[PDB]
């Protein structure tokens, strides 16, 4: 019983990258049948599964690799905080990817899952396009120490790429925060309040995502399972430090946004007073005119207006005089 | 929360210590070396003139103003045998008051 919770079902893809000291094989595939042998290879291998909405593929991979049904359900579940579980035959980490889009004020998320099994690393994504391109290029072009190392270093590299993209998202949010502060100080316009609320919601989501991430990485380096070599423990430690940075930044950012609300939020009763005053001003000067128009417009078959020449100019002047008196009264007593 | 090791920021080279505050205008070292019957007050701008006061028998009060100059802080910490993490904490203004007991 495996069900898929998210809303991404557009595409499915698979690709294997088996790299060694001097030879690499990068095979793009369309079905799981090719990646079945990649369990007993001596060299590090990276399996990439895109579009897990086809639950059959992940079920087959988990059955072949011995992945527990519960953690398979965790893989399928898309609304879950990042978390790490250490098992004897593999270590299972699940993390979040973010993609802020400018000119839209919206934050999009995605769930990615890494499974380290001795000589291989499985990656489960949900859409075409990711943030692990630099690792791919470094493996392809032999532009680092990645080839010389095992699959645990691959896990380190992928988490490092995730943290770097977190930093990029932080840069984007920094630009948004600066422009929003300028707008709110210059002119607290109505759309700016909605923008600030959306920014606050995005920062709350980002905090609630990042904070379990540093716990995951702490569990990664501080108490290494036998799968992670003690030689690669310091590198993981570095990544932990980086998340610290992110967290602090987010916290600072959140603080700022809170201020951006209160400075606007409490000073609203002034708007209530202005609306009260406008309504009273244009209701206290026009109800009397309507009433006098009614009484002198009242039909009676008789009136003190049988001839009464120039009476209509008299009543128009009465209207004008009353209006002028009320205007002067409010000007002098300051309801305007 | 176990063991003390230098934190690694990703925007900096691995060992560099950075000043965090927003003041660069001042720098001055005031040494005040007193005793029961004497005291020497000595205001300077050379870091190398305060080093002999580490081994002074009498009490001495060194006051370095302008920690924005990280080289002076690093030199004083290196001479007085101060741990590099304590130096990073010294230069890190954005932190709460704290106390650490070392040997």
């Amino acid at each position, epitope marked *: 019983t495996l069900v898929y919770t998210g809303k991404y079902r557009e595409d499915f893809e698979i690709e294997v990258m088996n790299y060694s000291i001097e030879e690499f094989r990068e095979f793009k595939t369309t079905d799981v049948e090719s990646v079945l042998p990649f369990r007993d290879s001596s060299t590090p291998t990276w399996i990439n599964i895109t579009g897990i909405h086809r639950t059959d593929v992940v079920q087959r991979v988990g059955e072949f690799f011995g992945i527990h049904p519960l953690v398979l359900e965790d893989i399928l579940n898309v609304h879950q905080r990042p978390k790490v579980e250490f098992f004897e035959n593999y270590v299972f980490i699940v993390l979040k990817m973010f993609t802020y889009d400018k000119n839209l004020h919206e934050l999009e998320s995605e769930q990615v899952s890494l499974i380290l099994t001795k000589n291989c690393v499985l990656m489960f994504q949900e859409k075409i396009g990711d943030v692990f391109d630099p690792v791919r290029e470094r493996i392809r072009y032999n532009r680092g120490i990645i080839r010389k190392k095992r699959a645990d270093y691959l896990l380190y590299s992928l988490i490092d790429a995730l943290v770097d993209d977190y*930093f990029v998202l*932080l*840069e*984007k949010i*920094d*630009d948004e925060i*600066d*422009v929003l502060e*300028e707008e709110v100080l210059e002119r607290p316009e109505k759309e700016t309040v909605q923008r600030t609320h959306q920014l606050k919601r995005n920062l709350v989501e980002l905090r609630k995502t990042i904070w379990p991430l540093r716990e995951v990485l702490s569990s990664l380096y501080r108490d290494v399972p036998p799968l992670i070599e003690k030689e690669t423990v310091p590198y993981f430690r570095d990544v932990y430090d980086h998340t610290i*940075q*992110i967290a*602090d*930044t987010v916290e*600072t950012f959140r603080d700022i946004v809170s201020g951006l609300l209160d400075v606007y939020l409490s000073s609203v009763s002034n708007k209530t007073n202005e609306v009260m005053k406008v309504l009273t001003i244009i209701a206290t000067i026009f109800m009397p005119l309507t009433f006098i128009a009614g009484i002198y417009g009242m039909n009676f078959e008789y009136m003190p207006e049988l001839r009464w020449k120039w009476g209509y100019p008299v009543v128009l002047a009465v209207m004008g005089v009353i209006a002028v008196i009320m205007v002067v009264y409010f000007k002098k007593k300051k309801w305007l | 929360m176990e063991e003390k090791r230098l934190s690694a*920021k990703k*925007g*900096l*080279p*691995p*060992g*560099t210590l*950075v*000043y*965090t*505050g*927003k003041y*660069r*205008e001042d720098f001055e070292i005031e040494v005040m070396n007193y005793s029961i019957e004497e005291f020497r007050e000595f205001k300077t*701008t*050379d870091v190398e003139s305060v080093l002999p006061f580490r081994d002074s028998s009498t009490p001495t009060w060194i006051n370095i103003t302008g920690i924005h100059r*990280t*080289d002076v802080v*690093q030199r004083v910490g290196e001479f007085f045998g101060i741990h590099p993490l304590v130096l990073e904490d010294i230069l890190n203004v*954005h932190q709460r008051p704290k106390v650490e007991f070392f040997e």
Partner: antibody, heavy 126, light 108 residues
């Protein structure tokens, strides 16, 4: 009282594909505690960053234009920074400046690097 | 790839006592790691402003820097005869520092 300054030498006429070793001797401060940058200024054009060395850890950054052929290093014994230029080009003729920088803090994640002291400059013609 | 800073105008002109504004646009997002330098013709560049708002110690307070999103402005409130030089941007968000085009300030 040290009168911080950077005196730079090594700029002379060379042939394309030739080799040069620009030297930047820094007086008034220690190279180990600061970052040293090199910058070009082609005659009539603007400033162009070239290389950067942090002698404390040897971490090195190069401009993409000169990457692969230039090499910046620093010796703390002589308190000097050397820029070795190989496989030069006729478009590389410029006035080279040596600069000292200090890192400053913007946010917990973001840092900034500002050059406060500069050298005189040396002409290198190819 | 590389963050590119573009300055406007490429050159301007003014008289002593005027107010001068130079604008600088970054292709990508640099948080506040932008610095403004002044270079007189034939001399080494001089640091004026760092972090887009802070001003280096020893420069007159007439120089001011501001940022709005990605746009960065350097403003001389009351230009003085010793302020007719070429002004440059710099971004140090990444290890690959890049400089702006450079705007000359002629005298009219």
């Amino acid at each position: 009282i040290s009168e911080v300054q950077l005196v730079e030498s090594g700029g002379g006429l060379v042939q394309p594909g030739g080799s040069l070793r620009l030297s930047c001797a820094a007086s008034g401060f220690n190279v180990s505690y600061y970052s040293i940058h090199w910058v070009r200024q082609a005659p009539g054009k603007g400033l162009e960053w070239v290389a950067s060395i942090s002698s404390s850890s040897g971490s090195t950054s190069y401009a993409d234009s000169v990457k692969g052929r230039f090499t910046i290093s620093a010796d703390t014994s002589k308190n000097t920074a050397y820029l070795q230029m190989n496989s030069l080009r006729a478009e590389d003729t410029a006035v080279y400046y040596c600069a000292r920088s200090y890192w400053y803090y913007i946010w917990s994640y973001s840092y900034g690097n500002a050059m406060d002291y500069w050298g005189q400059g040396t002409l290198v013609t190819v | 790839s590389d963050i590119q800073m573009t300055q406007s105008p490429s050159s301007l002109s003014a008289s002593v006592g005027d107010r001068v504004t130079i604008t600088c646009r970054a292709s990508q997002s640099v948080s506040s790691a932008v610095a403004w330098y002044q270079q007189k013709p034939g001399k080494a560049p001089k640091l004026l402003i760092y972090s887009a708002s802070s001003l280096y110690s020893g420069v007159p307070s007439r120089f001011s820097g501001s940022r709005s999103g990605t746009d960065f402005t350097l403003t001389i409130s009351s230009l003085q005869p010793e302020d007719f030089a070429t002004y440059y941007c710099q971004q140090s968000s990444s290890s690959l520092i890049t400089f702006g085009q450079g705007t000359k300030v002629e005298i009219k």
